C-alpha cells in the first residue's frame, strides 16, 4: 500500500537556492527566493527531514553536490527530497554560470546508481521556468531503475513560472502551506493536488506590462511512485 516511512531517519532535504547569477550570463536576480528557501527549511524540518541549504551554486557545484549526495549511505533513511530554486527552461535548471540538464541531476539517484535509496521515494521539487509561454487563463525480483521518482514542477511544460519578490514564488508558498496544513492527514499526491488548486485559483499576476499582466499558473506533478506516501 504505502512506502515504509519508519526508518530511523526521514532522510535528507537538499535545497539549492540560486538568487544571483554571473553578470556574463545576463540572468536576472531572483528576488523573493530567500523567502522560499527559509519557508522550505522550516516546513521540512517540521517533517523531520535533515535539511541542507546551499546558495548560489555554479552548474559544476550543483552536479558535484548531487553526485556526492547520491554517494552517501541512505540505508537508515526513508526517503530523499531535493528542492531546486533557480531560473530554468524546459528540461534545464540554471547554475549561477550556466545550465544543467535536470535528467543529469536526477539520474544520480536511479535505482541502479543509488542502492541505499532503491525502493524509496525520491522527490524532486522544481521552482524554475519551463519556457516562455504565458497562461491567459479563462473566466470560470527486479524493479525499474526509473521507479519511485516524483517530480513536482511549479508550472506547465513550456511555461514561465511566477515568483513574487516580496512573498516568494506562487508554487513554493502554496506547497509549504499545504504541507503544514495537510501532512498530518493527506497522502502526498492529494497534498500536491491541493497545491495545484491553490496556485491555479488564488494567484494572478499584476503588471504594468500588458504582455505580463493578468496571467495564471498550474503546477504539474510527474509521478513514477509505486506506493502511497504519508509523512505521518
Amino acid at each position: 500500500n504505502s512506502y515504509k516511512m519508519d526508518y530511523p531517519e526521514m532522510g535528507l532535504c537538499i535545497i539549492i537556492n540560486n538568487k544571483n547569477f554571473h553578470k556574463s550570463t545576463g540572468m536576472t536576480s531572483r528576488s523573493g527566493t530567500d523567502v522560499d528557501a527559509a519557508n522550505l527549511r522550516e516546513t521540512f524540518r517540521n517533517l523531520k527531514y535533515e535539511v541542507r541549504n546551499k546558495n548560489d551554486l555554479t552548474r559544476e557545484e550543483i552536479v558535484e553536490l548531487m553526485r556526492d549526495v547520491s554517494k552517501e549511505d541512505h540505508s537508515k533513511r526513508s526517503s530523499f527530497v531535493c528542492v531546486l530554486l533557480s531560473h530554468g527552461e524546459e528540461g534545464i535548471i540554471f547554475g549561477t554560470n550556466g545550465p544543467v540538464d535536470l535528467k543529469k541531476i536526477t539520474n544520480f539517484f536511479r535505482g541502479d546508481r543509488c542502492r541505499s535509496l532503491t525502493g524509496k521515494p525520491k522527490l524532486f521539487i522544481i521552482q524554475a521556468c519551463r519556457g516562455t509561454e504565458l497562461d491567459c487563463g479563462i473566466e470560470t525480483h527486479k524493479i525499474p531503475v526509473e521507479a519511485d521518482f516524483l517530480y513536482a514542477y511549479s508550472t506547465a511544460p513550456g511555461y514561465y513560472s511566477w515568483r513574487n519578490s516580496k512573498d516568494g514564488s506562487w508554487f513554493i508558498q502554496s506547497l509549504c502551506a499545504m504541507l503544514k496544513q495537510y501532512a498530518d492527514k493527506l497522502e502526498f499526491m492529494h497534498i500536491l493536488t491541493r497545491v495545484n488548486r491553490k496556485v491555479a485559483t488564488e494567484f494572478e499576476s499584476f503588471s504594468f506590462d500588458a504582455t505580463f499582466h493578468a496571467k495564471k499558473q498550474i503546477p504539474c506533478i510527474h509521478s513514477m511512485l509505486t506506493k502511497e506516501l504519508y509523512f505521518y
Binding site: 531572483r30 523573493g32 521556468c129 515568483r163 519578490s165 503588471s207
Partner: peptide, 4 residues
C-alpha cells in the same frame, strides 16, 4: 510579480 516576476517570471523565473
Amino acid at each position: 510579480d516576476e517570471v523565473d
